[PDB]
Amino acid sequence: MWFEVLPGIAVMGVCLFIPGMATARIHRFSNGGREKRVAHYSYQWYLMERDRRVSGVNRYYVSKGLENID
Amino acid sequence: SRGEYVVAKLDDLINWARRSSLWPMTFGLACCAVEMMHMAAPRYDMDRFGVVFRASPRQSDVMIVAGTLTNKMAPALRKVYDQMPEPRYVVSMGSCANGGGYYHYSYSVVRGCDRIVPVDIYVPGCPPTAEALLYGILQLQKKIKREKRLRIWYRR
Amino acid sequence: PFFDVQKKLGVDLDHWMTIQSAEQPHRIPARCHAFEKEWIECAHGIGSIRAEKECKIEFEDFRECLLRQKTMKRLNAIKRQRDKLIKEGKYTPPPHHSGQEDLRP
Amino acid sequence: MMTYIVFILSIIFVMGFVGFSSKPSPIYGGLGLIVSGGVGCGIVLNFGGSFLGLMVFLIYLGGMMVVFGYTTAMATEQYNKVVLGTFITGLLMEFLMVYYVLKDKEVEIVFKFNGMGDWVIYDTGDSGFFSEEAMGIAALYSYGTWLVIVTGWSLLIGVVVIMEITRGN
Amino acid sequence: MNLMITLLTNFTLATLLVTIAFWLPQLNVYSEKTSPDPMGSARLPFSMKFFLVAITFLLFDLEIALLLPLPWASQTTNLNTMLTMALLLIFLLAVSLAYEWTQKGLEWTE
Amino acid sequence: MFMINVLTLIIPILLAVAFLTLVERKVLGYMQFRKGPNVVGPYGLLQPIADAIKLFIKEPLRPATSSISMFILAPILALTLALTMWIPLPMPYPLINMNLGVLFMLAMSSLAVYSILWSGWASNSKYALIGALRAVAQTISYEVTLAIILLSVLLMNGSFTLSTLIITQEQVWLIFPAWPLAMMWFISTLAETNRAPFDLTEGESGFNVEYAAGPFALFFMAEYANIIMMNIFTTTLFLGAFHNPYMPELYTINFTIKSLLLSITFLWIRASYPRFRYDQLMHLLWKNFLPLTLALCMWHVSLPILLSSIPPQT
Amino acid sequence: YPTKETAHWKPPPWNDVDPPKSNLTLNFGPQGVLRLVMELSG
Amino acid sequence: VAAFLKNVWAKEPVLVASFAIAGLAVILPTLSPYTKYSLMINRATPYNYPVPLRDDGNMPDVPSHPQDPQGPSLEWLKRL
Amino acid sequence: MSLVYMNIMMAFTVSLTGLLMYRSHLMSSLLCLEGMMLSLFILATLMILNSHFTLASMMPIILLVFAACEAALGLSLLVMVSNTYGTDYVQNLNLLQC
Ligand code: SF4
């Protein structure tokens, strides 16, 4: 009866779940297993550029910890 | 050979696509239009076959002539048929569209709509029942199914 | 005629937007705050003729800050001479100008 | 060739102007103005003016040029040498400026123009935790009381004037 | 660079789809049609109401543009002046709407 | 790597709108005591494929257009502004993270009417031109009311960033402090996309009747993508979900369910009411919606000031 | 001082009002069935 | 007055509701005691750097350290 | 000065020459005028954002709105012309030669 419309809604729900999951997995994969950094203002971009310039890899997501000091 | 099989499968694919998505353009002339709308009713439900209800004449495939075609009306029907995209089919439903019916000997009635447009399926009745018109639509689907356009193109 | 209604009535309508070294939201400074400030404190109250003949140095400095004619002219000269010596083969770029510097921070 | 991106965009900008300075038809002139507006929004986007670029897209293109084309559709009923001639002429002079300023890096017509990229005159600092242009616009209510008053009175008077003069009686 | 790439991808997918839709059944062989709407011979008469609602939309859109930066402006230090100017802007918008209402401006396209 | 993200954004849009046509037919049919398509595939799952292959092999109309440039360009702009408009959507992370995503979407909403205008102009029939003018007027009027409602809701939010709407809705939904704005926003998005009971071209002519089967299909894809995205925008704006930074799939499933319910509500509204007249919907906007919009705009300007509830800029 | 060029120039009207120098008609075809000929004024 | 108000509540409820909301919005900030809290919340946000002052020798009110008791306090914002 | 200043000034110049030579219509001249206003907008905001003039960022929006309001007025006048001679041709606006 009324549940025969559910395969179409299931297909639509799969097709709408795909882009968000894909974007989250791509962001985690391309940024060292973490969230993509949000740079909405110039200060956050300055911090991101400082991490990229301090990593030694030219990758901002390789975070240098306390082992890199004397 | 390979090419004959390829064009046979392609012809089957396009035949299924054309026959499973028929969009009809009815002609609400007379009694047979009321019986057509009774076929579109929830009991018989043309829409479950992919046959939509009241499609526009500018995008429709099949024209259903349901009613009596008079002398004052036939040029409009021919204009509508000429402004329809190919591939197109015409279904004559009821006795009036087939051979005039009750008003065959009238001075102002076209004795059959086959004098104006070429007709593929003739549905007899006065009015033919909604099951009869649905059976005619299914028979038109069978007629579309056994088309051989690509086989003729490859053979020529 | 210029009827100074604002100065007679003591109201402020458009003086906050006239110049560039004025009070700004969040005290954001412009790129030529000091030059225009120096030009304004020169030319205050000495008249237009004395302003245009007495501190032309400050106005030239402010215009140079504003449009940067001489700066990009010097940059054009440096880049043109560098390209000419690169074509003539007597000059090469150092490694720190090529992208292997491992910069400061 | 990437570093000249704004300059490259600017070429399309003036090219779009020759799209409607020749005046081929109001529909094609409107299309050229739409292309020029999008290109100018991109130009101001590359300078940090995001709110002003979206002002260009929201108010110029989607607000005013829509009304211009909407009134165009009520005239110039649907169905030249001079249009193509001045288009070719303007394109030829425009590429002459491009070639000259890319050749000798310093030209003049009325003012002295430099042939370097647009990236040189940029600022090396950081604005902090805010966008300077955003707070500059946001100071419309805190500082621009008089400007708000005269603009609102102008818009109200414009509404009155518009509905008055088209009455015809 | 990401936004330009996305815009170019959307644009090129759109023109690929338009070219496919406009040219794929063109290679089929069919029969042509003659060169021949209720108002074919009649000219289009002008209507003042559509132009009036167009200009009304334009003026309200301009006042919307003036009213837009309120989320940024709410973080100010002159809160009384900001509140007064915002309320004055919306009040002038409502006054323009009411004056258009009273003078039969919204007639037959209400 | 980024182009993979773009493709995984844009191809499910086309799949979703094809199966939205299927879901519309099935749900509409079951609401009027019959069935939808269940013959072509198993429960009609092969119906959109058959419709697409049928529509792409039909003979093109080839109308006698006054201009061919506008005739080509209207589907171009329609599809481009249908697909570009999905990118700043925070699901829960956007494809392009922008500071002014709401303003971006409003700009493309204002820009989308040129497809209607150029389609009306390119057709040689002047009746299609009249219908296009009426559709353009309706779209720009509801654009005005959309802009004011969005301004008030974002003034509650405090910034134009679309991802901040998830943060500002962590405790409670925004349908609780802004339900009149929610109702009027829903009706305005209904009337924006020429959705029932606000469509006029179907009733007594269309602007896109002169287009071929292919371009009509592309216009259909653009319109249905706009419908789905508008429902997603309403879900993000008013009915935000719980977001866990370690499991984004929770937010994805939650807002997917909510936007599916809102799209089903769109189809449900389509099969319940008679069509509005043109002057009646003008009366609904300019004499009913707009005064309440201005009053609620004043209320939402003044409310955070008097409650010490001003949201942060960042 | 009339010349050859300004020989056809007429004086303006005394009230400065010039002479002012239609109803739309539609034909809805048979596309039950009915043909309507309508005369509108907007 | 009461007959007129009931009449417009009978004919035009939308305009009555809009005018009531607008009047509430225009008279309520002048009566709510929380506007000053908004003012000093907007004042206390540190957008810029608090640049230190040179110690001339007599400034008892200004602090010498961030954790010193001098300077403004923020317990009211912590509690509210 | 910069290259984009030359390009924007040239755009303003060609739109001015487009305005000053009427071809047949008046809508085309109105479009040329709005092109001039757009070039003024772009030049002003480029100069303002280059020099970090903070308060002056409030200005070009006004430069839009006022001029945009003027555009609406112009459209109305065109419609009045279209109500008299049935077309927006400029060669009908010569009733005041005598
Ligand atoms: S065939 Fe019979 S039922 Fe059908 S239209 Fe003719 S008279 Fe009516």
Kindly list the partner chains of chain A, i.e. chains with 3 or more CB atom pairs below 8 Å.
C, D, F
C-alpha–C-alpha distance, residues F136 and F120, integer Å: 10
C-alpha–C-alpha distance, residues D165 and D65, integer Å: 22
Looking at beta carbons, which residues of chain B come within 8 Å of G33?
27-29, 67, 73
Which of ligand 1's atoms lies nearest the C-alpha of B94? Answer: 1
Longest Cα separation, chain C: 71
- Domain presence at residue I97: no
Phi, psi at B62, each rounded to 5°:
-110, 140
Helices B130-145, B2-19: crossing angle, 10 deg rounding? 160
Q: Judge whether F135 and F209 are in contact, CB under 8 Å.
A: no
Contacts of F212 (CB under 8 A, 6+ apart): E21, E22, F58, F60, F61, F62
The closest CB to that of H42, out of F287, F294, F310, belongs to: F310
C-alpha–C-alpha distance, residues B84 and B89, integer Å: 10
The torsion of the CA quartet F115, F121, F122, F123, rounded to 10 degrees, works out to 110
C-alpha–C-alpha distance, residues F49 and F182, integer Å: 36
Identify any residues that bridge with F244 across adjacent strands, giving them in sequence order: F247
C-alpha–C-alpha distance, residues I8 and I42, integer Å: 7
- What are the tokens at F69? 């440039």
Length of chain G: 42
The closest CB to that of F30, out of A2, A19, A21, belongs to: A2
Identify any residues that bridge with B64 across adjacent strands, giving them in sequence order: B26, B91
C-alpha–C-alpha distance, residues F111 and E58, integer Å: 14
d(CA H59, nearest CA chain F) in Å: 34
- Domain presence at residue I95: no
The residue behind tokens 């529909």 is D27
Three-class SS of B88-126? CEEEEECHHHHHCHHHCCCCCECCCHHHCCCCCEEECCC
Which of ligand 1's atoms lies nearest the C-alpha of B125? Answer: 1
C-alpha–C-alpha distance, residues H31 and I10, integer Å: 57
Kindly list the partner chains of chain F, i.e. chains with 3 or more CB atom pairs below 8 Å.
A, B, D, E, H
Ranges of H-type helices in chain F: 2-30, 47-55, 68-83, 101-111, 113-122, 126-157, 164-167, 179-192, 213-238, 248-270, 278-283, 290-307
For ligand 1, whether the C-beta of B68 sits within 6 Å is: yes
Contacts of E94 (CB under 8 A, 6+ apart): F291, F294, H22
Size of interface D-F (CB pairs under 8 A): 60
- What are the tokens at B23? 């969009």
Burial B82-98 (b: 16+ CB within 10 A, else e): eebbebbbbbbbbbbbb
Nearest one of E89, H46, B60, I73 to F216, comparing CA atoms: B60
The residue behind tokens 């076959």 is B49
Q: How far is the CA of G27 from the centre of ligand 1 (A)?
A: 28
* Strand (E) or helix (H) holding G24: strand G24-28
Looking at beta carbons, which residues of chain D come within 8 Å of I73?
158, 161-162
The CA radius of gyration of chain D, in Å to the nearest whole number, is 21
Range of the domain at I73: 1-86
Ranges of H-type helices in chain D: 5-21, 26-45, 50-55, 66-72, 81-103, 132-142, 145-165
Q: Judge whether B149 and B87 are in contact, CB under 8 Å.
A: no
- What are the tokens at B32? 């047979």
User: CA torsion sign, H1 to H6 to H11 to H17?
Assistant: positive
- Domain presence at residue I31: yes
Residue with CA closest to ligand 1 atom 2: B126
C-alpha–C-alpha distance, residues F164 and E6, integer Å: 23
d(CA D139, nearest CA chain I) in Å: 7
Q: How far is the CA of B66 from the centre of ligand 1 (A)?
A: 8
Domains defined along chain E, listed by start: 1-103 (1.20.58.1610)
For ligand 1, whether the C-beta of B95 sits within 6 Å is: yes
- Strands of the sheet containing B62-66, edge to edge, are B24-28, B62-66, B89-93, B121-123
Give the C-alpha distances (Å, rounded to integers) separating F239 from B138, F182, F310. 47, 10, 21
C-alpha–C-alpha distance, residues C82 and C95, integer Å: 16
Nearest one of E42, F280, F207 to G39, comparing CA atoms: E42
H75 CB-side CA count, 13 A: 3
> For residue G12, what is the DSSP state?
P
For residue D134, what is the nearest residue in chain E, using CA coordinates? E72
Q: Is B63 exposed, middle or buried (0-12, 13-18, 19+ CB in 10 A)?
A: buried
Dump the DSSP string for C59-99.
HHHHHHHHH-HHHHHHHHHHHHHHHHHHHHTS----GGGTT
Q: Judge whether E34 and I54 are in contact, CB under 8 Å.
A: no
d(CA D130, nearest CA chain H) in Å: 8
Looking at beta carbons, which residues of chain C come within 8 Å of A50?
105
Identify any residues that bridge with B121 across adjacent strands, giving them in sequence order: B91
Say yes or no for a CB contact (<8 Å) between B28 and G30: no
Nearest one of F68, F59, F313, F267 to F168, comparing CA atoms: F313
Nearest one of D50, D51, D64, D47 to D9, comparing CA atoms: D47
Say yes or no for a CB contact (<8 Å) between B86 and E33: no
> For residue F142, what is the DSSP state?
H
**Would you call the peptide bond into F60 cis, given omega within 30 degrees of 0 as the criterion?**
no
For residue D129, what is the nearest residue in chain H, using CA coordinates? H47
Domain boundaries, chain A: 1-70
- Other Cβ atoms closer than 10 A to F223: 17
Looking at beta carbons, which residues of chain B come within 8 Å of F119?
none
Residues 69-98 of I with CB under 8 A from E: 69, 72, 75-76, 79, 82-83
Q: Judge whether B21 and F21 are in contact, CB under 8 Å.
A: no
Contacts of F168 (CB under 8 A, 6+ apart): F156, F157, F158, F174, F311
- Other Cβ atoms closer than 10 A to H59: 12
Kindly list the partner chains of chain B, i.e. chains with 3 or more CB atom pairs below 8 Å.
E, F, G
- To test the pocket of ligand 1, the residue of B27, B38, B102, B110 to mutate (highest count of ligand atoms within 8 Å of its CB) is B102
**Would you call the peptide bond into F42 cis, given omega within 30 degrees of 0 as the criterion?**
no
Give the C-alpha distances (Å, rounded to integers) separating H28 from F178, H34, H35. 18, 11, 10
Top residue of A15, A31, A41 to mutate, by most chain F CBs within 10 Å, is: A15
For residue F305, what is the nearest residue in chain H, using CA coordinates? H35
User: Is residue G36 within 8 angstroms of chain B, CB to CB?
Assistant: no
Chain mean position to CA D21: 14
Helix (H, G, I), strand (E, B) or coil at D112: strand
Helix (H, G, I), strand (E, B) or coil at D108: strand
Phi, psi at D110, each rounded to 5°:
-115, -40
Dump the DSSP string for I10-55.
HHHHHHHHHHHS--SBSHHHHHHHHHHHHHHHHHHHHHHHHTT-SG
Question: How is domain D4-166 classified at the CATH fold level?
Answer: Four Helix Bundle (Hemerythrin (Met), subunit A) (1.20.120)
Identify any residues that bridge with G38 across adjacent strands, giving them in sequence order: G26
C-alpha–C-alpha distance, residues I41 and I62, integer Å: 10
Burial A20-40 (b: 16+ CB within 10 A, else e): bebbbebbeeeeeeeebeebb
Say yes or no for a CB contact (<8 Å) between I69 and E65: no
